[PDB]
Every structure is written in structure tokens, then in C-alpha cells.
Design a protein around this ligand. Structure first.
Ligand SMILES: CC/C=C/C/C=C\C/C=C\CCCCCCCC(=O)OC[C@H](COP(=O)(O)O)OC(=O)CCCCCCCCCCCCCCCCCC
Ligand SMILES: CC/C=C/C/C=C\C/C=C\CCCCCCCC(=O)OC[C@H](COP(=O)(O)O)OC(=O)CCCCCCCCCCCCCCCCCC
Ligand SMILES: CCCCCCCCCCCCC(=O)O[C@@H](COC(=O)CCCCCCCCCCC)COP(=O)(O)O
Lengths: 472, 472
């Protein structure tokens, strides 16, 4: 019973590490700017450096496990992330911080796609995989709330003390990764060098272009060149991949209708979840006036509700089709979002009108996450599990900003319509703050509509329970 | 004052009597079989005799009130129902019981469609009609539950005493109708004899064919002949109605999108409700093992929740359109149905697992019923309210068995699939009982899908609160 727990914790540790690091880096940005004397461009680049190498090197990270070994790749990625976090905590100027963030991104990109593949390969299909997927999904929310709590608590001493928290935890994971997991010593494949190079070039160019667009204006020299590089690399990669042994991206797997619908649903659902997280955090900290520590403490009921939902769904997936459970979770999520949209404003008490929608939405999200994760890794085999996991994780991470940009644009337009201001929150009055609150409650409706679209899309899955959650 | 209460009670009395008698007759079939020495055909015909003349003479009864008088027709129908209920108890052989059931069905068909017309033509549009509609919808469920209770607690001595409880209630409702309702003094109309005869023949032939089909077969000469006669009579009726002085069925009134969509929604909603009632009852006395009295006592919270929902909706219909209220009530009902499907099996305790879905579904049904039946009698006038009410009642009564057949076929198919058997429940062992449990909780999902379709189609009503629930 201890071996199973050690294995699942070791496999899911990297999700916790990455999410907590991202949340802490978001929280402690102004202190970094003040102490290190960075401009707005440097402040944005502190966050951009991580995502550049995180999104650039994810397909290569997915394919690398078949060449080196999934256990070894996982351990190497975790170790690189820990050492790079130490370098972040020790950094003394802007260049060193940027280099350390790039190294953190490289380590995360190496280690993250291997975790889902390890979930799929270590545990055979059945109850064990259901429990493993439930734990894998719970660790992400645990990391998010832990990051908020730590960032709020350590806002008085220094930002350098917040980067060191990754040093212990990561070490622990390494130990578990060296103890619970076993190596099957399978025959090693041959890496696809040209495909990996083209994929990394295309992904890095796309990420850089998307990040530099709003900052320096679109079609302003750098953006057009980066976009040209991205499209040329993508077209060359697509052409080359048609005749490559051990493809980085196996396209023939995407002919099945179920896989296409499932991956589209994964993309859009990840976008919806990211939009909810960011918008609700901003609303709580800005309008309601809660500090970071107060919000981190108040978000624990979300973790408990999500754990309950995951526990229920991991047992229900053995009898009900994934589409039914997805609709069941979406029902509660939609109800919670509507209640939050229509009964929220400044001065509202915490308990009656805040914790209830959070708990109901957490239960719904927990009930809906497990069937999607089980459908994402169904019927792939041991030769394409790596690329499939990498593609699924990449789609989930990519879907977020695209929806968040639309939601923020809608919120800004509604703020300007009602008579608001585009300045800082703490330079506003009562009427402008009321306009901002109404804009936020208006954008919640667009998030709900996106969730409705997600449910309508997931209504076409067609996977039977015997295919995803039953042992042969 | 007390006049309003007496009037609404007198108008809903016929619905209460019909539903209570139906439930009591269904409960006490085995005792009738044992005492009268009947075969399976006699058992089927005891139920079929009432339905034959109830569905045969609905359309004629909807127009009979114009040429004689609504109060007089109501009183005559209730009196005939009471007399036939008296004669049912004192029956010695099969023939007397069959003719008593036929006469009772004739009285019910005369009196039932006149109640809705009296609701429409007694209280002017506004709050009074909303309250009358709420009482009219509540008395149906009240009668059903009390009939279940009475049949459970009375059929342990004699089945003849079960048919005699109708008499005091019929007498008190006759007294209330005589002393509360008032004459109209409207000019008498002319009865369309040809159309009435053709409609009666068509409906009777259709009901007889649908009843005899499953017992004999789909290739029997009698069934094919009955269906052919029904189709020919329907065609002749449609041809005759083109140039009728006072048509039994006005076909021109249905040239509106609102009315057509409303009537389709009424049909499918009646089907969904009937399927829910029958399936829930069969599950309770079959799987959970409750007696008739226990189920009747346990279904009281449904009546209370439905009353609360009706009271809320009769007040809310003056501000919100019928579409919004229907969608909200259906949302609550769908949530209750999904909760029941997911977490229900033999051995669950009553308190945490039964009352909550029942209460939520009752609130949803009560909130959804009032706008639907308020929209069915909107903008017709005095000279066309009778046939419209008759058509609404007929569509509700017709929608039930259609959906119930599909649900029962699905349940039987999955019972056979999971290793169950077809036979009396008293003989099956644990495996086949679990197969029945899973089959019922699986058919609940099909009921929920039917509700989803009902809501999607009801999204196209288009009525406004001023045309439905606003006076003047
Ligand atoms: C998602 C689809 C992928 C499916 C997976 C598919 C394939 C495999 C691939 C990855 C598998 C591994 C990850 C699987 C879990 C990913 C989701 C996850 O667990 O995510 C957790 C996020 C971090 O992830 P992120 O959201 O950043 O993606 O953290 C939080 O939830 C912090 C706390 C938020 C607190 C507010 C939450 C309110 C919820 C209720 C709404 C209430 C609304 C009204 C309230 C008032 C409003 C006033 C305006
Ligand atoms: C319907 C649309 C027309 C609208 C009106 C249209 C036109 C006008 C014309 C008539 C207007 C006047 C009548 C209007 C109300 C007619 C419906 C009515 O009130 O009906 C009541 C029935 C009697 O009437 P009947 O339905 O027989 O016609 O009585 C019961 O419902 C007893 C209670 C049983 C239980 C059910 C409720 C479960 C709720 C929970 C569900 C989930 C539970 C899961 C548990 C586990 C399950 C495992 C399998
Ligand atoms: C008398 C009887 C009257 C009856 C009247 C009935 C009237 C109609 C009643 C309401 C009908 C039931 C209902 O609300 O169904 C929707 C419920 O799911 C949704 O909202 C979808 C939500 C999807 C969310 C997907 C993502 C979730 C997780 C995201 C993070 C991972 C689904 O609808 P659809 O999308 O069209 O399939």
C-alpha cells in the first residue's frame, strides 16, 4: 500500500512543483522589480523566459523518454528544475535571473511530458490507473493553492526566500522517484533529430512572437519575422514528418474521430479553467480587497471539493461513459458560475455567497477532469504514448492564454462602456470600482458560455467504459 | 374569500378523482383477479375498459359543454363517475366490472376537459387565473399520492372498499360545484354530429389497436383492420372539418409557431412525467422492497415540494417569461434525475438518498408546470376554449405511453444484457436483481435525455408575460 502511494506522489510531483513555482513567481513580481531595478520590459521578460523554453522544448521532451528512459528523464528534469530554482534564488542581476528562468523552463519541459506517460505506463488499465489519474489531477490544484499561501506569507521578508521553497520539495520527489519506480529496460529507439529541431524552432518562434506582439506592437518588424520563421518551420516539419522513422508527432493517430474530439475538448476546457483561475484571483484580490494570504487560505475549500469530486469520479468511471460524467460535472460548474455571476458585488460576506459556488464548482471540475484524462491516453500503445502525452499537455497549456485574452478584452470593453478607467486599481473611486466589478461579473457569463460550448463539443466522444477504465 | 377557495377546489375535484381512481385500480389488480377468477386477458381488460372510453370521447366532451352548459356538463360527468364507482364495488362477474369501468371512463371523459375550460372562463386573466392554475396542477399530484396511500392501507381486507372511497369525495365536489360555480347564460351553439362521430370512431379504434397490438401481435388481422379503420376515420374527419359550422377541432388556430411549439412541449413533457412516475413506482416496490403504504407515505415530500414550486411560480409568472421559468424548473429536475441515476442502488438509506432528489425534482416540476399550462389557454376566446382544452388534455394523456414503451424496452434490453431474466421478481436471485437495479438506473438516463430534448424544443416559445399573466 505504501509503494502505490510513493509511486503516485513521485509521478505527480512535477505538476505541483511547476504550478507552485508559477504562482509564486506571479505573486512576488513587484518586489523583484523594486529590488533588482527592472523596467516594464524586464518585468515581463522575467515571466516570459520560463514559458519560452517550457513551450519550446515539450515535444522533444515527450519523445526523449523512449531514447533515454522515462525514469531517468524524469529524474534529470526534476534535478535541473531544482538546481535552476537555487540559481534563481541566488541571482544578483537581470541577466542571471533570465538565464535561471530559462533553465527552469528547460527542466520543466523535459520532466512534465514524462509524468503523464509514466502514469499511463506504470499502472495497467483498471482501478490503478483511475486512482493515479485522480492523484495526478489533484496535485495541480494543491500546488496552486500552496503557491498562493507561500507567496502571501513570505511577502514581508524577501522574494529570494520564496524561490528556495522548491529546493526541499523537489529533492523529496527525486528520492521517491529513485525508490518506488522501476525500470523495464526496454529496447532504446533512435531519436528523430530533424523533426525535433524543426518542432522546437517552430514552437519557440511562435511563443516569442505571441509574447512580443502586445509589448512592441504587432507587425512591427520583430513580430513579422518571428511569424515567418514559425510558419516556415511548421511547414518544413509537416513535410519532413511524412517519411521519418519514430515520428515526433504521429499524425495517423489523429484520424480517429474520438481522439480529435477529445483533444479539442481538452484544449478548450484547459482554456476555460485558466480563465476562471486568473479572473477569480484578480477579482478577489482587487475588488474584494483580500490580500494574497487571505485568498490562499480561503481557496482551500476548493481543494477539498475537488478532491471529493475526483474521488467520486474515479469510482464512477467504471460504469458510466466519459461523456455522461463530463455532462454531470458541467451541470454543477454551470450552476455555480451562474450563481456567482448574478449574486456577487463588493461588500458581500464571505461564507454565504463565496464558499458555496467555489465548493460546487470544485466538485463539478473534479467530476469532469478524470474521464477526460482517461480518454486522452486510451488505445495508444507503448510506442506512441510519449508523443500523445506531450501533445495533450501542450494543448492544455496552450488553450489558456487564448481564451484569457478574449475574456480580458471583453472585461476591458465593458469597463470602458460603463464609465471606468484604465489606470491602476488603487487610483480609482467608488463609481469606477463599481464599473470594474460589473465588468468582471459580466465576463463570468462569457466564461459560462465557453463552458457550454465545451459540453456541446464533449457530447460527441463515444468512448465506452470498457475501453478506458476496464482491465482486460 | 371562501368563494374562491370553493370554486378552485370544485374545479380541481375531477382531476383528483380521476388520478386517485387510476392509482387505486392499478394497485388492487391481483385481488380482483383472485376473487373474480380472471385470466391475464381479464386483468388487461379491466384497465383497458376505462382507457378506451376515456380516450374515445375526449374530443366530443370538449365541445359538448358549449351546446349544453359547462356547469351542467361538469356536474353530469362527476355524477356519472360517482354512480359508476358505486356500481364497480357491487360486481359479481367480469361483464359487470367491465361495463362499470366503461361507464366510469365515459363520465371521466365528459367531465375532465371541462375543468380546464372552467379554469379559463371562470377567473379573468391575472393573479386569479394563476392561483387557479396552481391549485389545478396541485390537486392532480395530491390525488395520485392519496390514492396510492389509500390503496396500500385499504386493500388488506377487500378490494371492493377501495372503489367506495370515491363516493364521498364525488358528492362533496358536486355540492361545491353546485354552490360555488355560476351559470354563463351564453347563447347555445350547434353540435357538429358528423365530426364528433368520426373523431370518436377514430380515437376508439386507435386506442383499441394500440392496446391489442402487444398481446396478439403486430401481424394480426384484427390489429391491422383496427388501424386501417382508425386511419380512414381520421382522414374522413379531417375532410369534414374543412367546412363545419362549429368544428370539433379548429385546425386554423394552430397556424401560430407559439401554439404549435407549446403543444409539442406539452406532449413530450406529459410523456416524461408519466415515465418518471411509473419507473419510480416500479423501482420502489420492486427493488427497494417498500410496500404500497410505505411508498405512499414516503412520496408526501414530493407533494410538499411541488406545492412550494407552484406557489413560487404563480407569483413569478408576472415578471418573467414562461421560457425562463420552464428552463429553470427543467434544470432543477435534470439535476435531480442525474443525482438519482449516479448514486442509487439497493441498500441505500432513505433519508440522505431519496428525499433530496425527490424534493428537488418536485420543486422543478412545480416551477415548470404553471407557465406551460398558462400558455396553453392563452388568446383563444370563449367560443374556442373548449376544443383547445380538450386537445391539451388529449396530448398530455397520449404522450405518456409513447415514451413509457421506449423506456421499458430499454430497461428490458439491458436487464437481459447484464445476465438478468424475464419473469416474476419474487423468484430471481441476487445477480438478476442487481441486473434490474442497473437497468432502472440506466433508463433514468434516457428519461433525462428526453427532458433535455423537451427543453431544447421549449426554447422556442416566444410568449411574453403580458400576454399570459397580466390582467386587462
Ligand atoms: C482542465 C482540463 C484538463 C484536462 C486534462 C486533459 C489531459 C491531460 C493534461 C493534463 C492533466 C493534468 C492537469 C489536470 C487538472 C487541470 C485543472 C486543474 O486542476 O487546475 C487547477 C488550477 C491550476 O491550473 P490552471 O487553471 O492554471 O490550468 O488551480 C486552481 O484551480 C487554483 C484555485 C482556483 C480558485 C477558483 C476556482 C473556482 C471554481 C468554481 C467557479 C466559481 C465561480 C463563481 C465564484 C465567484 C466569481 C466572482 C467573479
Ligand atoms: C406535465 C406537463 C404538462 C403540463 C400541463 C399541460 C396542459 C394542461 C393539462 C393539465 C394540467 C394539470 C396537470 C399538471 C400536472 C401533471 C403532472 C403531475 O403533477 O403528475 C403527478 C403524478 C400523477 O399524474 P401523472 O404523472 O400520472 O399524469 O404523480 C406523481 O408524480 C407522484 C410522485 C411520483 C414521483 C415523481 C417525481 C420524482 C422526482 C425525482 C426524480 C428522480 C428520483 C430518482 C430516485 C431513484 C430512481 C431509480 C430508478
Ligand atoms: C415537466 C418537465 C419539464 C422539463 C423541462 C426541461 C427543460 C430543460 C432543462 C435543462 C436540460 C439539461 C441541461 O441543462 O443540460 C446541459 C447541462 O450541461 C451543461 O450545461 C454543459 C456544461 C459543460 C461543461 C464542460 C466542462 C466541465 C469541466 C471544465 C473544467 C475541466 C447540457 O446541454 P447540452 O450542452 O445541449 O447537451
Amino acid at each position: 500500500s505504501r509503494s502505490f502511494i510513493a509511486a503516485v506522489i513521485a509521478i505527480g510531483g512535477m505538476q505541483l512543483l511547476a504550478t507552485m513555482d508559477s504562482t509564486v513567481a506571479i505573486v512576488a513580481l513587484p518586489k523583484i522589480q523594486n529590488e533588482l531595478s527592472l523596467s516594464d520590459a524586464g518585468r515581463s521578460w522575467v515571466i516570459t523566459a520560463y514559458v519560452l523554453t517550457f513551450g519550446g522544448l515539450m515535444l522533444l521532451g515527450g519523445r526523449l523518454g523512449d531514447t533515454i528512459g522515462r525514469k531517468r528523464t524524469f529524474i534529470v528534469g526534476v534535478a535541473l528544475f531544482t538546481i535552476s530554482s537555487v540559481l534563481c534564488a541566488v541571482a544578483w542581476d537581470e541577466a542571471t535571473l533570465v538565464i535561471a528562468r530559462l533553465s527552469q523552463g528547460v527542466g520543466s519541459a523535459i520532466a512534465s511530458p514524462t509524468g503523464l506517460a509514466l502514469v499511463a505506463t506504470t499502472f495497467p488499465k483498471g482501478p490503478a490507473r483511475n486512482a493515479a489519474t485522480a492523484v495526478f489531477a489533484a496535485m495541480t490544484a494543491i500546488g496552486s493553492v500552496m503557491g498562493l499561501v507561500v507567496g502571501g506569507a513570505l511577502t514581508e521578508v524577501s522574494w529570494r526566500w520564496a524561490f528556495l521553497v522548491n529546493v526541499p520539495i523537489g529533492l523529496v520527489m527525486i528520492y521517491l522517484a529513485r525508490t518506488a519506480l522501476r525500470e523495464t529496460n526496454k529496447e532504446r529507439m533512435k531519436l528523430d533529430a530533424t523533426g525535433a529541431i524543426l518542432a522546437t524552432l517552430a514552437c519557440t518562434a511562435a511563443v516569442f512572437a505571441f509574447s512580443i506582439g502586445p509589448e512592441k506592437g504587432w507587425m512591427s518588424g520583430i513580430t513579422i519575422g518571428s511569424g515567418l520563421v514559425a510558419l516556415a518551420a511548421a511547414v518544413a516539419f509537416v513535410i519532413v514528418e511524412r517519411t521519418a522513422e519514430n515520428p515526433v508527432v504521429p499524425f495517423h493517430l489523429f484520424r480517429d474521430r474520438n481522439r480529435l474530439v477529445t483533444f479539442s475538448a481538452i484544449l478548450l476546457a484547459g482554456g476555460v479553467m485558466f480563465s476562471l483561475t486568473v479572473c477569480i484571483g484578480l477579482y478577489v484580490q482587487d475588488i474584494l480587497g483580500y490580500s494574497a494570504l487571505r485568498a490562499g487560505v480561503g481557496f482551500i475549500p476548493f481543494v477539498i471539493a475537488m478532491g471529493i469530486g475526483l474521488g467520486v469520479s474515479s469510482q464512477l468511471v467504471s460504469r458510466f461513459s466519459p461523456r455522461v460524467l463530463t455532462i454531470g460535472g458541467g451541470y454543477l460548474l454551470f450552476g455555480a458560475m451562474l450563481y456567482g455571476s448574478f449574486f456577487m458585488h463588493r461588500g458581500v460576506p464571505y461564507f454565504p455567497n463565496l464558499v458555496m459556488p467555489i465548493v460546487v464548482g470544485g466538485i463539478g471540475i473534479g467530476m469532469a477532469v478524470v474521464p477526460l484524462t482517461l480518454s486522452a491516453i486510451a488505445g495508444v500503445g507503448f510506442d506512441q504514448i510519449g508523443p500523445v502525452s506531450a501533445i495533450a499537455l501542450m494543448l492544455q497549456s496552450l488553450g489558456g492564454p487564448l481564451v484569457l485574452a478574449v475574456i480580458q478584452a471583453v472585461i476591458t470593453s465593458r469597463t470602458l462602456y460603463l464609465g471606468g478607467t484604465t489606470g491602476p486599481v488603487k487610483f480609482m473611486n467608488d463609481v469606477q470600482l463599481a464599473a470594474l466589478d460589473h465588468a468582471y461579473t459580466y465576463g463570468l457569463l462569457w466564461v459560462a458560455g465557453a463552458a457550454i460550448i465545451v459540453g456541446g463539443m464533449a457530447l460527441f466522444i463515444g468512448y465506452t467504459p470498457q475501453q478506458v477504465a476496464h482491465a482486460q
